[PDB]
Design an enzyme around this catalytic site. Sequence first.
Site, PDB file in Angstrom:
ATOM      1  N   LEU A  22       2.806   2.833  -6.411  1.00 10.39           N
ATOM      2  CA  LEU A  22       1.353   2.932  -6.438  1.00 10.39           C
ATOM      3  C   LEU A  22       0.966   4.001  -7.413  1.00 10.39           C
ATOM      4  CD1 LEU A  22       0.062   3.196  -2.843  1.00 10.39           C
ATOM      5  CD2 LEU A  22       0.137   1.138  -4.384  1.00 10.39           C
ATOM      6  N   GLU A  30      -6.337   1.559   3.607  1.00 16.77           N
ATOM      7  CA  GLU A  30      -6.428   0.558   2.536  1.00 16.77           C
ATOM      8  C   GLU A  30      -5.280  -0.459   2.705  1.00 16.77           C
ATOM      9  OE1 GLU A  30      -6.962  -2.089  -0.452  1.00 16.77           O
ATOM     10  OE2 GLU A  30      -5.097  -0.874  -0.530  1.00 16.77           O
TER      11      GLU A  30
HETATM   12  C1  LIG Z   1       3.153  -7.203  -2.214  1.00 13.88           C
HETATM   13  O1  LIG Z   1       3.114  -6.613  -0.917  1.00 13.88           O
HETATM   14  C2  LIG Z   1       2.207  -5.603  -0.690  1.00 13.88           C
HETATM   15  C3  LIG Z   1       1.349  -5.077  -1.660  1.00 13.88           C
HETATM   16  C4  LIG Z   1       0.413  -4.067  -1.376  1.00 13.88           C
HETATM   17  C5  LIG Z   1      -0.467  -3.562  -2.542  1.00 13.88           C
HETATM   18  C6  LIG Z   1      -1.941  -3.843  -2.272  1.00 13.88           C
HETATM   19  C7  LIG Z   1      -2.684  -2.899  -1.615  1.00 13.88           C
HETATM   20  N1  LIG Z   1      -3.973  -3.088  -1.369  1.00 13.88           N
HETATM   21  C8  LIG Z   1      -4.599  -4.219  -1.729  1.00 13.88           C
HETATM   22  N2  LIG Z   1      -5.911  -4.347  -1.387  1.00 13.88           N
HETATM   23  N3  LIG Z   1      -3.952  -5.185  -2.398  1.00 13.88           N
HETATM   24  C9  LIG Z   1      -2.649  -5.064  -2.694  1.00 13.88           C
HETATM   25  N4  LIG Z   1      -1.995  -6.053  -3.335  1.00 13.88           N
HETATM   26  C10 LIG Z   1       0.286  -3.579  -0.045  1.00 13.88           C
HETATM   27  C11 LIG Z   1       1.132  -4.069   0.995  1.00 13.88           C
HETATM   28  O2  LIG Z   1       1.109  -3.597   2.288  1.00 13.88           O
HETATM   29  C12 LIG Z   1       0.159  -2.537   2.482  1.00 13.88           C
HETATM   30  C13 LIG Z   1       2.111  -5.120   0.687  1.00 13.88           C
HETATM   31  O3  LIG Z   1       2.956  -5.594   1.630  1.00 13.88           O
HETATM   32  C14 LIG Z   1       4.265  -5.002   1.677  1.00 13.88           C
HETATM   33  C1  LIG Z   2       3.384  -0.493   3.018  1.00 21.12           C
HETATM   34  O1  LIG Z   2       3.999  -0.950   1.821  1.00 21.12           O
HETATM   35  C2  LIG Z   2       4.220  -0.044   0.815  1.00 21.12           C
HETATM   36  C3  LIG Z   2       4.292   1.312   1.127  1.00 21.12           C
HETATM   37  C4  LIG Z   2       4.524   2.270   0.145  1.00 21.12           C
HETATM   38  C5  LIG Z   2       4.583   3.732   0.514  1.00 21.12           C
HETATM   39  C6  LIG Z   2       5.710   3.860   1.504  1.00 21.12           C
HETATM   40  C7  LIG Z   2       5.452   3.898   2.857  1.00 21.12           C
HETATM   41  N1  LIG Z   2       6.481   3.999   3.696  1.00 21.12           N
HETATM   42  C8  LIG Z   2       7.748   4.051   3.247  1.00 21.12           C
HETATM   43  N2  LIG Z   2       8.716   4.158   4.152  1.00 21.12           N
HETATM   44  N3  LIG Z   2       8.085   4.025   1.947  1.00 21.12           N
HETATM   45  C9  LIG Z   2       7.114   3.947   1.032  1.00 21.12           C
HETATM   46  N4  LIG Z   2       7.434   3.900  -0.275  1.00 21.12           N
HETATM   47  C10 LIG Z   2       4.703   1.933  -1.181  1.00 21.12           C
HETATM   48  C11 LIG Z   2       4.652   0.618  -1.581  1.00 21.12           C
HETATM   49  O2  LIG Z   2       4.829   0.322  -2.893  1.00 21.12           O
HETATM   50  C12 LIG Z   2       5.800   1.044  -3.642  1.00 21.12           C
HETATM   51  C13 LIG Z   2       4.407  -0.450  -0.586  1.00 21.12           C
HETATM   52  O3  LIG Z   2       4.384  -1.758  -0.983  1.00 21.12           O
HETATM   53  C14 LIG Z   2       3.147  -2.414  -1.048  1.00 21.12           C
END
Ligand SMILES: COc1cc(Cc2cnc(N)nc2N)cc(OC)c1OC
Ligand SMILES: COc1cc(Cc2cnc(N)nc2N)cc(OC)c1OC
Length: 186
Positions: A22, A30
């Site tokens: 991220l 979020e």
């Molecule tokens: C591809 O999988 C994930 C991706 C994200 C990034 C994300 C986070 N926020 C929004 N609104 N859209 C997104 N695509 C967030 C996720 O969980 C919070 C995901 O599941 C593991």
């Molecule tokens: C909930 O899903 C995600 C969470 C995070 C932050 C995060 C949150 N928890 C853990 N154990 N590892 C992380 N890297 C980071 C991410 O992207 C690198 C995710 O994928 C959408």
Amino acid sequence: VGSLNCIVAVSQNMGIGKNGDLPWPPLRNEFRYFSRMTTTSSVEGKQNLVIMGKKTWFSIPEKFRPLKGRINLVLSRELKEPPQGAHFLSRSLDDALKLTEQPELANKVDMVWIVGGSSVYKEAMNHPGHLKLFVTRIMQDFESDTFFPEIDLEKYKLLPEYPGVLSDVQEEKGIKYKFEVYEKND
Ligand SMILES: COc1cc(Cc2cnc(N)nc2N)cc(OC)c1OC
Ligand SMILES: COc1cc(Cc2cnc(N)nc2N)cc(OC)c1OC
């Protein structure tokens, strides 16, 4: 199969990723919003399908792969089988949607959620048809190396509100953000 949708969070300078992490500090509410929208299926006895490229799949921490309660499909031409923990593999977006029509998925899949990365967003966004974009605007610039494609507002209409989507400004970790829904049909 129900509706086709993209879902993304994006910074002010359009950034969606920095070295497959991220660009911003983790925003827990979020993320809750992402999990809620993608998991919630209208139609009983079905799950939503999530479609993502290979880099997006490998960007998820292991404990969160596959996205639970959703069918997981990865896009890739190099891979010859679904990665460990994923359910389905297709060569392209077009092929993944075609599959959604076969017998092994037609009765199983409700909504389809495209969850990235930027080339899969771009082709979905530019393909004719009924498509919604669920876009979280993170209202700060964050250093990034991958970006959301341009949203053509001639085609995508921003909706004045949407059930289950908060309309007002949110803030977590000192970062303000807001939820938006765009809809085209062409
Ligand atoms: C591809 O999988 C994930 C991706 C994200 C990034 C994300 C986070 N926020 C929004 N609104 N859209 C997104 N695509 C967030 C996720 O969980 C919070 C995901 O599941 C593991
Ligand atoms: C909930 O899903 C995600 C969470 C995070 C932050 C995060 C949150 N928890 C853990 N154990 N590892 C992380 N890297 C980071 C991410 O992207 C690198 C995710 O994928 C959408």
